[PDB]
Each structure stands twice: as structure tokens, then as C-alpha cells.
Amino acid sequence: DFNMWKNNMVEQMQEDVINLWDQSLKPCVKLTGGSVITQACPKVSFEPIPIHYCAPAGFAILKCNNKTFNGKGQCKNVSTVQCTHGIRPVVSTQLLLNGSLAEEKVVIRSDNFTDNAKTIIVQLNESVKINCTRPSNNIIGDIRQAHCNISRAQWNNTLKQIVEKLREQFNNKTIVFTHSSGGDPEIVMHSFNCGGEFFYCNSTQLFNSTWNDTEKSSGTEGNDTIILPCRIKQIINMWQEVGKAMYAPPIKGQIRCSSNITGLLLTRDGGKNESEIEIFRPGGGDMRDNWRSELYKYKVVKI
Amino acid sequence: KKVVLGKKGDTVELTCTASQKKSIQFHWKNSNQIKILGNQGSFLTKGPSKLNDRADSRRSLWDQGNFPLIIKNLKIEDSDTYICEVEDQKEEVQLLVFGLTANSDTHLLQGQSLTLTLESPPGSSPSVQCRSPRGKNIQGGKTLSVSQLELQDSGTWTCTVLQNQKKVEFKIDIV
Amino acid sequence: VQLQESGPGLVRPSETLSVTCIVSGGSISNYYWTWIRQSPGKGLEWIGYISDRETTTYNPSLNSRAVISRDTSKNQLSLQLRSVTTADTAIYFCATARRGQRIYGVVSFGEFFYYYYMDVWGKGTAVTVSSASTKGPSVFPLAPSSSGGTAALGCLVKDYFPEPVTVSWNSGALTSGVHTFPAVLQSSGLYSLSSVVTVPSSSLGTQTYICNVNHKPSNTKVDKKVEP
Amino acid sequence: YVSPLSVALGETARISCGRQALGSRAVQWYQHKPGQAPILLIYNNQDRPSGIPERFSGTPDINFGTTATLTISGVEVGDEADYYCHMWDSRSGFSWSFGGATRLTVLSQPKAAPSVTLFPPSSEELQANKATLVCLISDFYPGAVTVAWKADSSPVKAGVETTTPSKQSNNKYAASSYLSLTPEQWKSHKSYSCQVTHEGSTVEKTVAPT
Ligand SMILES: *[C@@H]1O[C@H](CO)[C@@H](O[C@@H]2O[C@H](CO)[C@@H](O[C@@H]3O[C@H](CO[C@H]4O[C@H](CO[C@H]5O[C@H](CO)[C@@H](O)[C@H](O)[C@@H]5O[C@H]5O[C@H](CO)[C@@H](O)[C@H](O)[C@@H]5O)[C@@H](O)[C@H](O[C@H]5O[C@H](CO)[C@@H](O)[C@H](O)[C@@H]5O)[C@@H]4O)[C@@H](O)[C@H](O[C@H]4O[C@H](CO)[C@@H](O)[C@H](O)[C@@H]4O[C@H]4O[C@H](CO)[C@@H](O)[C@H](O)[C@@H]4O[C@H]4O[C@H](CO)[C@@H](O)[C@H](O)[C@@H]4O)[C@@H]3O)[C@H](O)[C@H]2NC(C)=O)[C@H](O)[C@H]1NC(C)=O
Ligand SMILES: *[C@@H]1O[C@H](CO)[C@@H](O)[C@H](O)[C@H]1NC(C)=O
Ligand SMILES: *[C@@H]1O[C@H](CO)[C@@H](O)[C@H](O)[C@H]1NC(C)=O
Ligand SMILES: *[C@@H]1O[C@H](CO)[C@@H](O)[C@H](O)[C@H]1NC(C)=O
Ligand SMILES: *[C@@H]1O[C@H](CO)[C@@H](O)[C@H](O)[C@H]1NC(C)=O
Ligand SMILES: *[C@@H]1O[C@H](CO)[C@@H](O)[C@H](O)[C@H]1NC(C)=O
Ligand SMILES: *[C@@H]1O[C@H](CO)[C@@H](O)[C@H](O)[C@H]1NC(C)=O
Ligand SMILES: *[C@@H]1O[C@H](CO)[C@@H](O)[C@H](O)[C@H]1NC(C)=O
Ligand SMILES: *[C@@H]1O[C@H](CO)[C@@H](O)[C@H](O)[C@H]1NC(C)=O
Ligand SMILES: [Cl-]
């Protein structure tokens, strides 16, 4: 009886990344109680190393092997290994980055599809490249806009797959992708970490379409290369605990990072407005969902 | 079954509390299952409701399992039944918003007549009682009038709108 | 494409200057065009420029005393300069302007800038702000002497204001070697130059040499002949 | 304005653009020989128009903070001119000023003795009650020539006007002296000599009435 949504490895994982972000990325100031904690912050470059969840002897993790597994069902084929695979825990708000690709067909997962307030996690057939940079050293010399590049073609193909898998679960109703309704800048925008810089990037370009079928769609046409504009912050809202925190700038120079997009975090509006249409927006912020996306194929039992 | 009244243009805090005294996922929806506002992680999400730019919370309390929905500058259309799904329990509140405007010339010359009207939400069956400066009463189911206006009635009127055995007060300055 | 300017050479002190440029080869409607002067003791000053789509842009320095225009039919550029003064005395050049773009970043984000360079220029026209009387030259001939086999003859253009005078030989036939001279300024305040050419003495008598003196500010034209 | 630079003939000259560049740039170099029209030497940063030798060279804007500099390798005598650097970068805005011009002087060319021609008062001229003589100095370097009129072995007392040597299309100096007389005065003497002197070395030329 697997259950990715009530897994306990995911909470341990979470605590692991929090502790990894202490030491690795120390904030000058946290504001909470207010407690107003201060701590020396040396400029640093951050890149998450992989983590493994380990089973204490006398306990074990079972690894499900269903190439397509929803995450909340009896698992037919089951294995028993000592430690989970290596998982590099990117903390990212809207798009899952560097996560393992789904075997065979695209997979979408919810604890409850029907509760519009439960998050849908998306795992991809194949990965989409995203490239982000903040060129202008920091204003000396050229004024350049920090930005992200995605392929319109590959994004369109990925959307086409996501639509086929969503339409299955939603009775074939036309499905619409739109931007975040409201929220903190972190979740309104594709927020991520590249070279110790805290990027906020505008994904609306990513989610401006109407799909009636897996063909016959609206708003998807455009230039070959999608260019998301970004802002870069240092006083940010914390993901680890409810508060604000100020970080250090990084070791100087151009930040350039290319990340596979292996997953999405969508929520649908729903509610009794009908219209025979479903609206999906990007979401995230509970990083547990990010770990879930990797640990759906694992569970701990006593021996 | 909670019933909270609210004056138009006022602010209300619809309370919600958890068994645990730590922060966890909570969602405020309205009757039509439209997501009003929630939390993902330590982050505030705002759903696509009508309340969007007036809804907010108080995240400083989240840490002790307290997830209030705050609606500012109230409107009659905001009258609804709001639910706070947290920890797999469904707290229900019903918010009723009333206005009581005088829409007066600001110069009721003697013998002129009010001029007092009530704005009310669908379903509500509000009773209004208006008390004059002197102590004179006027009763109105949906509207209020003074048959003749005398110099004694001038001053600050105290109106009580009753609804579901709960009350609310509008004061109006008249001349 | 080729450019040739012209102007009054003299301009009175309150009046308005006007100079012009005639283009050849290409059409004036296909090119950005620009005026640039060069006052004495001052460096090259950029007056302003007019585009292909006939919009204009002037240098802040000239206090908007400047009108650059395009006459498509006559195929000419003109520049007028209002309210002129002694500091407006200079050699006015018109020139092709070419708009390059120096792209340093993402073009959608407007991460680039336009610059302008001047490849093709005019010979240029000299203008002097002055109240002074304009005046044409009287040229006399300088007859060859009778070393071998070459002998040298020429013209003497005396008392012409203001500079410059142009001397050609046998229309434009004799190019080499004609050596026209820097003019001289007399106590009278009028210029007087001379123009010689070395050439075979075995060509004397038979081959007839005429010089052509052009003094555009006058506008005097004059040919004379040189005989032994 | 007009900062002066001097180079050895045959050696290399390096003129640095007088204005630093704030961010990415496009520098133009114009050569200007007063009296003549300017000439575009370098556009873009290091690109050359046709007709411009490979010996003129700009400095490409490839790395940060590199100084814009025109280089003239193997200067020739016809490289003497004012050099303007028209800076354009991404940080300042529209460039409206060419800026100060570097004035190149080529040291030091080979010596050249003057080439003298003298001319007796012409016919028409003489007829019109005015007699002027035309001493024509030419093809010399350095451009410093002293001119004195012989006046039949007695130095002339008046009527001399000499130009100051101005350079020519052949990169050597030319000058001009005019003795001016009344026709009576011309005939009143047998000979007339103008002597020009260049590096303490005199050349004399004479003419007489006929
Ligand atoms: C996310 O996605 C975004 C969308 O894709 C993406 O945006 C891109 O970002 C990059 C940077 O991150 C930008 O890159 C730069 O690109 C500039 C533009 O490049 C194009 O255009 C130029 C010029 O084209 C005109 O001129 C040439 C030259 O004669 C002509 O041949 C052309 O016909 C053309 O002229 C016509 O059009 C003109 C309009 O521009 C008209 O004015 C004209 O009248 C004509 O109609 C081309 O040269 C480029 O092609 C060359 O490079 C491309 C790739 O860029 C190659 O594919 C191609 O084969 C060629 O090799 C291209 O077409 C560049 O100008 C710019 O780089 C310069 O500046 C930087 C810093 O300032 C220097 O580091 C660099 O060295 C360059 O400077 C050199 O060149 C300039 C100009 O020549 C000189 O002034 C300078 O001195 C220096 O010269 C030296 O090097 C030269 C060549 O390197 C050499 O020639 C000289 O001899 C000398 O050695 C830089 O490359 C890019 O613009 C964005 N693109 C868009 C469309 O948005 C973003 O990057 C992505 N980021 C992520 C997420 O990863
Ligand atoms: C990105 O995906 C490719 C497969 O397309 C893989 O080779 C590469 O290792 C991935 N990068 C990371 C950082 O996981
Ligand atoms: C899905 O969500 C709806 C929300 O009201 C709920 O009725 C239903 O029980 C949920 N499904 C489950 C818990 O399996
Ligand atoms: C992103 O960068 C990678 C690695 O440089 C490259 O292979 C890919 O083509 C890029 N994708 C874009 C620019 O959309
Ligand atoms: C996605 O964009 C590509 C590239 O512009 C375009 O050719 C394609 O039609 C789009 N995909 C759709 C409409 O499914
Ligand atoms: C970015 O998002 C804003 C709203 O935050 C939206 O209006 C705009 O269209 C978006 N721009 C791009 C390039 O996605
Ligand atoms: C979304 O599509 C509309 C046209 O349907 C377009 O005008 C708008 O700019 C698009 N949004 C983005 C972010 O490109
Ligand atoms: C994913 O890994 C790539 C390649 O190792 C790296 O450039 C990038 O920073 C990672 N993505 C993140 C941290 O979002
Ligand atoms: C689409 O391309 C055009 C030029 O082809 C450009 O002006 C525009 O900014 C591009 N749009 C986006 C959203 O990148
Ligand atoms: Cl770049």
C-alpha cells in the first residue's frame, strides 16, 4: 500500500534540504517572530548535490517498478533496495528542474484530482531545456536583462502531451493554461536558484493557450524561441519557514545555467462555474511536492 | 453554522484554527467551490475569486495553526458561505454584509423627510431599528422614513440591523 | 554616388546662410544625408542629418537655427542657417550618413544602439560671414621663355575676393603636371593666385594652351590663352 | 582639441581615442587634411572602407575595458593630418561630437631644394599701367624659405608680398612671392632678380624688359 501523498520519507527529505540550505546558503538576516536573526553571510555559489534517503537496518524501503505508477495504489511489482536513487534537490517554485523523467508515457498525479485545491504533479516523457542568465555584472558597462530561454517547439509538444493526459482524467473538456491567480512573487513567478542568485522569471508566456483537442489549440503560435524576462532578488520570502530573509550576492560575473524541465506543478480552478472547460495554472511553494515528485516510487516498512 | 455580519466598506476576519499548533496546508473556498485563498508551504496563494485583490491573511499566526481569511473594504456581493479546509475538517462560516446609507442632501431643511435606505444581500431577512437623538424610534423591514421632520430629530441616529439573532450598528449624522 | 556642394561664399552678418549639395549616380531618396562644417580653429562640427524617410535631427548646439531639406526633383540637399554670425564662417560639407546598429544583447529587450558613419563626402564649400563687397579676378597670361625640352607657362589671377579661385587647363585636358598655387593676400585685402604647368618646348606654337579660371562667388568665368 | 602627436617616418603611430567607452562601443576614425574633405578611415570598430590601406587599424571591441586606438603602421608623409575618433557606446546616448583631433606630424622627411620660376610683367598687364612679377617657389622641404628681390643688385625698397609655405598634393611645400611695380620702374632698370634661400642655400633667377 504505497502512498506518495502520505509518505514520511518526504518530510525527512524536506528537513534534509532545509539543513543543506543552512551552511550552503546562509542568510544575513531572517525576520520571523519578529526574531530578527543575524548571521555572517559570505558570498557563495550554490549548486545542490544529490541526496539519498537511507534505510536504517531493521527497516527497509520498497521500490515500486510500475513504469507508470500513479502513487496511491497497491503496487504489483515491488523491489527492496538499501537506499533511494540519487536525487538532486532543486528548490523551484513553478517548474520542476532536473527531476527524473517518467518512463514511457507522461504521468499526472494528484492525491485528489477532484479537489481543486489539491496540487497536480506532472512528470514528463522527455525533458525540455531551459536556459537562464544574468549577464550584466553588478551598473558597470552594458545594461542587460536577466532572462530565460525555452524552445517554443518543444514546449508546444510537451503541452500537447500534458493536454492528452489531462483530458483523459477530465472527460475531454477543453483545457486552458493561464498564469497564477494571485500569490507571493515566488509562486506567481517561476522562482528558482541559479548560481546562488535568486531568480524570479515570468512564465505567463509559458501558459497562454486553449486546447480543445490534442490538435486544434489557440494561442500557442509564436516566435521559435520563448524568452522569459527575469528579476533577481536578495531580500526574499522564505520557503523553509514563514518569514523574510536577505541573502548575499554571489561570486561576481555572468551566471549561466541550463536546466532540464522534468516536471510541472499545476492546479486547476474548478468550482461551480461550469463552461465545460478546465483552467490550469502553475503553482508550487510547498517543496514537499518537489520531493514527492521523486519519491512516489518508494516506501518505508519495518522488518 | 457560524454567522458573521459585516458593514459595507468595513473589514472582517473570518477565523480558522487547527488542532496542531504548527503551520500546515489550509484553503479558503466559497460556496461555489471557488478557491479564495490558501497557503503553499510558507507562501500565500490567492485563488481566482472576486475577493482576490481584497482578500489577504495574517501569516505571522500561521506558525501556531491560525489561518484567518481577512476581507477588506466589504461589498454586499461578498455575502457568502466561506469554508476553511485544513487538516481534513471543513469549517463553515456565513458572512452577511449590510449597507445603510442616508443618501441625503446634507441639508434636510425643516419638515423634510429621511431618506434612510438599506442595502442587503440575497436571502437575508434583516430587521432595522433606528433610534433618534431624542429617543424616537422608527422601524423598517427594508427602508426607513420619518413622517415629518422636526428640529429635535437632528443629530446622530443609531440604527441596529438584526439578522440571525445577531446585530450590527450604523450611526448617521443628519441635520 | 557622388556629391558636389555650392554656396554664396559670402554672407552678410544678420542674414540667413543657404548652401546646397547635388548628388549623382544614386537617387537622393535612398540615402541618409548630413551636413558637417569646419570653422577655422574649431574642429569638425556636426550640423545635423535628414533620413531616407525625410525625418530630421539637428545638433542641440546650433540652437535650432538649422533647416536641412531634400528636393527630390532637383535631386538636392540644402541646409539653411538662420541669424548667422562671424562664428558661422566655415567650410560646409554634405555627406552620406549610414546607420549601423551595434547589437550587444537581446534585440527584443532593446539591447542595442544605432550609430552613424560618413563614408561619402562632398568637396565642400567655403562660406564667410561678411559685410564685404564681393569681387571677380582679372587674369593675364604668363608666357613661356625662349630646361629642354620642357618649358613653363601659366596664368596670373589678381585681386579676387573671396577665395577660392579654380584653375583648369585646356578645359580639363591638361592634368599633369599642372601646379596651381596658394593665393596671396594683399594689403588691399584681396587674393591673387597663379597657376603654372611644365610641358614640352617642342609642343610650343603648335599645341595651344588655355587656362580656365572659375570664381564661383562672382560668378566670373574666364579663359585665357598662353602664347610665346 | 588639437592635441599634437609626432612620429618617425616609417615607424608606427598609435593614437588613442580621447574618450573612454562606457560599455559596448562602435568607434569611427576619420582622417582630415584641412582644405580637403575628411575621410572615413575606420567604421564599426575595426572595419575598413575600400580604398583604405590595411596599415590603418582600429581595435576591436571583443573584451572588456580595451582602449580604443587607431594604429598607423609604417606612417608615410601623407599621413600628416588631424585624426578624429567618433566614440559611440551603449551608456551615454547619441554622440554629437567628433571630439578633439590628434594632429600627426611626420618626422622628419628627406630634404628637398626649392624649384624656382620667375615671370616678367605680362603684355596686357603692362598695358594696363600695372607691372607685377611672379616668383614661384616649389617642391621644397622643410617649408621655410626666405625670399628677397634683387632689383638689379640693389634690394627693392617696396612692393613685395610673399606667401607662407603651404603644403601640396605631393607632400612638399610651395610658396609664392610677388614684386609689384609701375611699368616705368620696370624698364628703368636692366635686370630684376629674386633670390630664394633654403637651408642657407640660395637659388637666383633674373628677368629683363624686352
Ligand atoms: C536567449 O535567446 C535570445 C534569442 O536568441 C538570445 O539573444 C541573443 O543574445 C546574444 C548575446 O547573449 C546576442 O549576441 C551578440 O549578437 C550581436 C548580433 O549578432 C547578429 O548580427 C551581427 C551583425 O549583423 C550585421 O552585420 C554583419 C557584419 O557585417 C553583417 O554581415 C550582417 O549582414 C548584418 O548587417 C545587416 O543587418 C544589420 C543589422 O544588425 C544592418 O545594420 C546592416 O545594414 C545589414 O542589413 C552578426 O555579425 C552576427 O552573425 C555573426 O554572429 C552570429 C551569431 O551572433 C553568427 O551566427 C554568424 O555566423 C556570425 O558569426 C549575428 O547575425 C553581435 O553583434 C554581438 O557580439 C558582439 O559584441 C560583443 C560584446 O559587445 C562581443 O563580445 C563580440 O565579439 C561582438 O563584437 C564584435 O563584433 C561587433 C560587430 O561586428 C564589432 O563592433 C566588435 O568590434 C567586435 O568585432 C570583432 O568580432 C567580430 C565578430 O565577432 C569580427 O567581425 C570583427 O572583425 C572583430 O574581430 C554578440 O554576438 C544576440 O544579438 C541576441 N540575439 C537576438 C536575436 O536576440 C540570448 O543570447 C539567449 N541567451 C540565453 C538564454 O542563453
Ligand atoms: C539533463 O537531461 C539529459 C538527458 O537529456 C541528461 O543527460 C543530463 O544528465 C541531465 N542533466 C542533469 C543535470 O540531470
Ligand atoms: C476529492 O475531493 C473532494 C472535495 O470535496 C472530496 O469530496 C473527495 O472525498 C475527495 N476524494 C478522496 C478523498 O478520495
Ligand atoms: C540551452 O542550452 C543548452 C546548453 O547550452 C543547449 O543545448 C540548448 O540548445 C539551449 N536551449 C535553448 C537556447 O533554447
Ligand atoms: C509551437 O511553436 C512552433 C514553433 O513556432 C510551431 O511551429 C508549432 O505550430 C507550435 N505548436 C503547436 C501549435 O502545437
Ligand atoms: C509577465 O506577467 C505579466 C503579469 O505579471 C503579464 O502581464 C505579461 O504578459 C507577462 N510577460 C511575459 C513576457 O510573459
Ligand atoms: C497571449 O496571447 C495574446 C493573444 O491571444 C497576446 O496578445 C498576449 O501577448 C499573449 N501573452 C504573452 C505573455 O505572450
Ligand atoms: C540542474 O543541473 C544543471 C546541470 O548540472 C545545472 O546547470 C542547474 O543549475 C541545475 N538546475 C537548477 C539548480 O535549477
Ligand atoms: C517575437 O519576435 C518579434 C520579431 O520577430 C519581436 O519583436 C518580439 O519581441 C518577439 N516576441 C517575444 C514575446 O519574444
Ligand atoms: Cl550574454
Contact by Cβ (8 Å): A283, A182 = no
Q: Chain A residues with CB inside 8 Å of B33's CB? A: 116, 270-272
- Inspect the interface and report whether the beta carbons of C104 and A142 lie closer than 8 Å: yes
- Decide if D1-108 and D109-210 have a common fold: yes
Grid cell 523574510 in the structure block, residue: A244
Report CA torsion sign: D168, D170, D171, D177.
negative
Within 8 A by CB and 6+ apart from C96, the residues are C1, C3, C31, C32, C33, C34, C118, C119, C120, C121
Classified as helix, coil or strand, C81 is strand
Planar angle of CA C69, C71, C73, nearest 5 degrees: 170
For residue C71 the three cell numbers come to 528636393
Q: How was this structure determined?
A: X-ray
Contact by Cβ (8 Å): B103, B75 = no
Residue D69, strand partner residues? D16
Q: DSSP letter at A219? A: S
Contact by Cβ (8 Å): B96, B3 = yes
Rounded Cα gap, residues A192 and A204, in angstroms? 16
Q: Chain D residues with CB inside 8 Å of C60's CB? A: 96
Q: Chain C residues with CB inside 8 Å of A142's CB? A: 104-105, 111
Within 8 A by CB and 6+ apart from C161, the residues are C132, C133, C134, C135, C189, C190, C191, C217
Q: How distant is the Cα of A6 from the closest Cα of chain B, in angstroms?
A: 13
Nearest atom, ligand 7, residue A218 CA: 5
- Cβ–ligand 8 distance for A132 under 6 Å, the answer no
- Cβ–ligand 7 distance for A208 under 6 Å, the answer yes
- Looking at all shown ligands, the one closest to residue A220's CA atom is 5
Q: Chain B residues with CB inside 8 Å of A184's CB? A: 43-45
Same domain, yes or no, for B83 and B125? no
Closest CA to B146 of B106, B117, B105: B117
Classified as helix, coil or strand, A1 is coil
Q: How distant is the Cα of C111 from the closest Cα of chain A, in angstroms?
A: 7
Residues making up chain B, counted from first to last: 175
Helix (H) or strand (E) holding D124: helix D123-127
Q: DSSP letter at B163? A: E
- Cβ–ligand 2 distance for A98 under 6 Å, the answer yes
Chains D vs B: touching, with 3+ CB pairs under 8 Å?
Answer: no
Resolution in A: 3.3
Grid cell 550618413 in the structure block, residue: C97
Q: Chain C residues with CB inside 8 Å of A144's CB? A: 104-106, 109, 111
Which of A115, A267, A268 has most ligand 3 atoms within 8 Å of CB, for mutation?
A115
Q: Count Cα atoms within 13 angstroms, Cβ side, for A235.
A: 2
Residue B41 CB-density burial (10 A; 0-12 exposed, 13-18 middle, 19+ buried): buried
β-strand C56-58 against C44-50: which pairing, if any? antiparallel
Q: Chain C residues with CB inside 8 Å of D99's CB? A: 43
For residue A46 the three cell numbers come to 550554490
CA Rg, chain D, in Å?
24
Amino acid letter for position A70 = N
Within 8 A by CB and 6+ apart from A143, the residues are A136, C111, D23, D90, D91
CATH architecture of A1-303: Beta Complex (2.170)
Within 8 A by CB and 6+ apart from B153, the residues are B132, B133, B134, B136, B146, B174
- Decide if C1-131 and C132-228 have a common fold: yes
Chain centre distance of CA A183: 16
Is A286 at the interface with chain B, CB within 8 A? Answer: yes
Pocket around ligand 9 at a 6 A CB cut-off: A 223, 227; C 108
Alpha-helical runs (H) found in chain A? 9-24, 152-169, 185-188, 287-295
Contact by Cβ (8 Å): D137, D145 = yes
* CATH number for the domain whose boundaries are C1-131: 2.60.40.10
Residue D83 C-alpha to ligand 1 middle, in angstroms? 28
Rounded Cα gap, residues D139 and D112, in angstroms? 7
Rounded Cα gap, residues B131 and B98, in angstroms? 18
Grid cell 594689403 in the structure block, residue: C187
- Inspect the interface and report whether the beta carbons of B47 and A286 lie closer than 8 Å: no
Rounded Cα gap, residues D199 and D210, in angstroms? 34
Rounded Cα gap, residues A291 and A296, in angstroms? 9
- Cβ–ligand 7 distance for A204 under 6 Å, the answer yes
Q: How distant is the Cα of A138 from the closest Cα of chain D, in angstroms?
A: 13
Residue A262 C-alpha to ligand 2 middle, in angstroms? 10
Contact by Cβ (8 Å): B59, B6 = no
- Cβ–ligand 5 distance for A136 under 6 Å, the answer no
Is B139 at the interface with chain A, CB within 8 A? Answer: no
- Cβ–ligand 7 distance for A219 under 6 Å, the answer yes
Residue B86 CB-density burial (10 A; 0-12 exposed, 13-18 middle, 19+ buried): buried
Rounded Cα gap, residues D45 and D60, in angstroms? 5
Closest CA to A98 of A265, A290, A297, A302: A290
- Inspect the interface and report whether the beta carbons of C108 and A227 lie closer than 8 Å: yes
Which of A96, A127, A158, A262 has most ligand 2 atoms within 8 Å of CB, for mutation?
A127
- Looking at all shown ligands, the one closest to residue A147's CA atom is 1
CA Rg, chain A, in Å?
20
Grid cell 606612417 in the structure block, residue: D75
Amino acid letter for position C56 = T
Please count the structural domains in chain B. 2
- Inspect the interface and report whether the beta carbons of D161 and C184 lie closer than 8 Å: yes
Planar angle of CA B150, B152, B154, nearest 5 degrees: 85
Last residue of a domain, one of B66, B98, B130: B98
For residue B99 the three cell numbers come to 449597507
For residue A272 the three cell numbers come to 461551480
Is D49 at the interface with chain C, CB within 8 A? Answer: yes
In chain D, what's the furthest Cα-to-Cα distance?
Answer: 78
Q: With respect to CATH, is domain D109-210 assigned 2.60.40.10?
A: yes
3-state DSSP of D35-99: CCCCEEEEECCCECCCCCCCCEECCCCCCCCCCCEEEECCCCHHHCCEEEEECCECCCCCCCCCC
Residue A11 C-alpha to ligand 3 middle, in angstroms? 23
Closest CA to C164 of C128, C140, C211: C128
Amino acid letter for position A303 = I
For residue D45 the three cell numbers come to 570598430
- Domain span at residue B20 reads 1-98
- Ligand 9, atom 11, lies closest to the CA of A223
Within 8 A by CB and 6+ apart from D136, the residues are C181, C194, C196, D116, D117, D118, D119, D174, D176
Residue A281 C-alpha to ligand 9 middle, in angstroms? 24
Amino acid letter for position B44 = L
Helix (H) or strand (E) holding A97: strand A95-97
Q: How distant is the Cα of D52 from the closest Cα of chain C, in angstroms?
A: 11
Fold assignment, D1-108: Immunoglobulin-like (2.60.40)
Domain ranges of chain A: 1-303
Q: How distant is the Cα of C10 from the closest Cα of chain D, in angstroms?
A: 17
Closest CA to C59 of C78, C36, C76, C39: C36
A161 phi and psi angles, rounded to 5 deg: -65, -45
Rounded Cα gap, residues A108 and A102, in angstroms? 10
Domain ranges of chain D: 1-108, 109-210
For residue B11 the three cell numbers come to 473589514
Q: Count Cα atoms within 13 angstroms, Cβ side, for D197.
A: 7
A168 phi and psi angles, rounded to 5 deg: -55, -60
CATH architecture of C132-228: Sandwich (2.60)
Contact by Cβ (8 Å): C127, D103 = no
Pocket around ligand 4 at a 6 A CB cut-off: A 129, 131, 149-151, 258
Q: Chain C residues with CB inside 8 Å of A135's CB? A: 105
Q: Chain A residues with CB inside 8 Å of C111's CB? A: 142-145
Rounded Cα gap, residues B135 and B152, in angstroms? 10
Alpha-helical runs (H) found in A3-118? 9-24
Amino acid letter for position A268 = R
Rounded Cα gap, residues A284 and A93, in angstroms? 5
Chain centre distance of CA B15: 14
Nearest atom, ligand 9, residue C108 CA: 9
Closest CA to D106 of D85, D80, D124, D86: D80
β-strand A277-282 against A255-268: which pairing, if any? antiparallel
Nearest atom, ligand 1, residue C104 CA: 72
3-state DSSP of D126-192: HHCCCEEEEEEEEEEECCCCEEEECCCCCCCCCCEEECCCEECCCCCEEEEEEEEECHHHHHCCCCE
- Which residue on chain C is closest to A148 by alpha carbon? C106
Q: How distant is the Cα of D94 from the closest Cα of chain C, in angstroms?
A: 8
> A72 to each of A4, A64, A109, D2, how far by Cα in Å?
6, 11, 9, 83
CA dihedral C214, C216, C217, C221 (to 10 degrees): 50
Residue A57 C-alpha to ligand 7 middle, in angstroms? 56
Classified as helix, coil or strand, C14 is coil
Residue C3, strand partner residues? C23
Residue A122, strand partner residues? A108, A264
Rounded Cα gap, residues A97 and A251, in angstroms? 23
Nearest atom, ligand 9, residue A222 CA: 1
Pick the residue of A142, A230, A256 with the most C CBs within 10 A to test the interface with C by mutation. Answer: A142
- Which residue on chain A is closest to B63 by alpha carbon? A242
Contact by Cβ (8 Å): D171, D79 = no
Is D146 at the interface with chain A, CB within 8 A? Answer: no
- Inspect the interface and report whether the beta carbons of C106 and A144 lie closer than 8 Å: yes
DSSP output for A223-292: -SEEEEEEEEESEEE-SSSSSEEE----SSS-EEEEEEEEEEEEEE--STT-TTEEEEEE----HHHHHH
